[model samples]
Target: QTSAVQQKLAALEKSSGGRLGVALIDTADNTQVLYRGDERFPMCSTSKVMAAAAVLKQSETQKQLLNQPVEIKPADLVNYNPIAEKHVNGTMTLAELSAAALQYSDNTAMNKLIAQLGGPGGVTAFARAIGDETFRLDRTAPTLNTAIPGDPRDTTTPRAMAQTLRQLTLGHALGETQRAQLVTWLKGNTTGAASIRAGLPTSWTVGDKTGSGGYGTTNDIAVIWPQGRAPLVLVTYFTQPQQNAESRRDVLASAARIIAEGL
Candidate 1:
């Protein structure tokens, strides 16, 4: 199975021209690889994974509800947010915000989660306790230039990001509460559908987070649950600042194809 799949992976690897990193894992058997996975890349919207976890962990650690009520004042509408677009001053639960953040890649929901956890560095600080130190959350989500400038506020190696996904989905990165729930939200995600979902059959359910970066760097990290079988994780990165976005998505689609077959 490995040799067969490796052939497909090699074919997909050809799609990687400029700067790229990929990681594929069979969670059932725990067989994985780090292809340039050690190199760091901007997390983009994919940073929501960590942000969402931090928010969930906050509620759990504080002994509260999974959908605890949260106030969203006008000031919270710091950016273009679909989650907070309907109301100037209203309320929703943490779970509701999380669904929007995870499913729609809502920046406002992400920023709110960051604040809920403590602030810009909150998620990073929270993740360190779960055995991750390098993944940084230096600013509120989508606050690239204003809040913190000069570099991608949140960055992680393919290895770090994929491992973070593994821990959260299969391990205890978010402790134990709502692990399945978060996975469900991720499954419905509409962001970067062209990257990972474009090449797959409709039957496959991929729980993923997609990041559109500053330099045409696009990323889609996911755990795919193929119908009637075990699950696997696929993390892809296009780091070249000059890389074309559509071309990057093509590479990701190819990689996803190779990963669809497993041991």
Candidate 2:
């Protein structure tokens, strides 16, 4: 089974122009890295997962009310405008914004949450708390000059991301309650559905996240269930100069689904 899985992944890498790297963990058998790519890349929005973890950790430790109403200042409402005209002059609680951040990849909501969490200092502290030393927030001038200042394009290794997901799944990152919250937010992610979502059987529940950026770089990471069976963590990053959005998504979905089926 394992060797067949490897062959399938290798085929995927070749078919995608050899521009992919993936890592899978089946926690049940202590299995790790069924296949791997470059491992290190400039992780795009996927960094939001770590950022979200940081926010939840603070919320858990300080007993900070996730439901506390947080006014959306005009200046801070720049990038995320999914319902731009409707929310143009509205307010939502921190919890609501956090949900928006994850579900819609709302830049405005994410920046607002980061500010509330105390900027880079808070985010860095949270990553350390979770034992991830390689993760970082983009807080340089280019990132800070925007309305959503400090939204540095973060980077991470596939191994690090899988480890972070494992921590969350095992309830070690922010304890059970916060972990549950993270999982819930992840399950609600409407973006990148074609990838992780495409892999699961209809009855199986999947909790996941995805990130993409300029260039052909794309990322998909998730936790999958057969419930009685231990959950699987799958991470894939792809970059090809000519790949379009749909092509990128389809390739990722195909890669993930093939791996899941083989397992």
Candidate 3:
């Protein structure tokens, strides 16, 4: 399966004119497919999933912590923050803020969570605690999305992201309720229409988070459940060096199609 996907993915990169980083893990049997899986790619908003898990972990003992309110302001606003923009000068629960961050990729909400959680280091700490040492979130939104080639800040390898996502969603990283909540928010994501989910069969249930940024960087990390089969975790990151290049979601979709067929 790995060799087959590798050959097909090599062909995909040739035709798509972009670099593809992919990682897939079958929880049922621990089968894996890795292509540039250890190469770093800008994380962009996909790190919101990490923020959600971090917040849940923080509130695990004090369940009411999520209910606490955080006041938003004009300073909190950032590009692509529809939900947070509306709540500026208003109040939103921390839990709701995390949900918006995951489901909408709301920048302001993400930054707010970052602040409360002890900056980008806090999120990175959570990832490391869960056994992913390569994952990093060095900056806040907007800046974090720079996606500069060879820049290590705010980047993660496909293997690191996929394994971390799997642990948080399916492993022992979070309690059952918190894990369910995190997965629920991912299931409600509205920004992945043209990415991984787009290439999958409509019958499959996909929970995902998407991130888009400079230099044709676009990514989706997901857990896909195909009918009766055990769930699979997949991370797909696409990037190109040309400035202002179009970040094509179809590249990710096509990658997904190839993986599904190869597996």
Candidate 4:
């Protein structure tokens, strides 16, 4: 028998005219609903959240790391870096760079942090350390956004992402202060208005990272705090096979609505 959540997600996939991968975890009760959750999808800017987690994890041991001033070179700037580009040849603290990377999806800030963390491999290592070997990042911004369909590079499974989020925010992967700061940055994200944040009720607090990519790939991984209930971890990734296919934000909004209905 098909469950209600599964049926709704299937309908959503059909209506979106794209492949939709969704994973919802009830952090309080440990209930989960997965639709194509094991399948890989381009991570795009969503990887910045993982990078932020990695930074926070290191901050747990390296108390002065986040506050250290870092110089930004002109060559480090890349596309879609609204925050970091302005700081080229200037300097920002590691904490500032981390917040810009996650909150604003600033590519240059993310790239710089990636370098500081010892490159893309370091981010992948953080995922591995937290028990999510499925997550990977093979490239940096502008290039990673290539988002080639069926490519394994710079991709993550919905299950893997959700699990990683669970570990970082709700579990023991990060210290309390770091986790709180991470959640604060996520809550301040400016780019997810049309994604998961738009889908949930205004009264509910949402913290998420948004990713846009080629082939109609759009994704949002979120933590939702509803009144009178524990937070929920929701990861949704959508993509169409055609490179020029429409990537609809409404599809993600609708998926969030469907998930909210069961709550």
Candidate maximizing TM-score = 3
The Cα error of candidate 2 at residue 86, in Å, is 4.1
TM per candidate: 0.85, 0.85, 0.98, 0.97
Model 2 shows how many backbone clashes?
2
The TM-score measured for candidate 3 stands at 0.98
Model 3 segments beyond 4 Å from truth?
none
lDDT of 1 at 37: 73
- Tens digits of per-residue lDDT for model 1, 29-120: 78776666787677778888888887777766667665677788877775658876564477878888888888887777877787787886
In the range 153-184, model 2's lDDT, one tens digit per residue, is 46556777777777876648776888898899
The local distance difference test score of model 3 is 0.91
Native-to-model Cα distance after best TM-score fit, residue 85 in candidate 1, in Å: 1.5
Ranking by lDDT: 3, 4, 1, 2
Sorted by TM-score, highest first, which candidate order results? 3, 4, 1, 2
Displacement of residue 188 (Cα, Å) in model 1 is 1.9
- Put down candidate 4 lDDT per residue, 127-181, tens digits, no spaces: 8998998999888776887778768999999999999988888788899999999
Alpha-carbon local distance difference test for all models: 0.73, 0.69, 0.91, 0.89
Winner on TM-score between 2 and 3 is: 3
lDDT at 65, model 1: 60
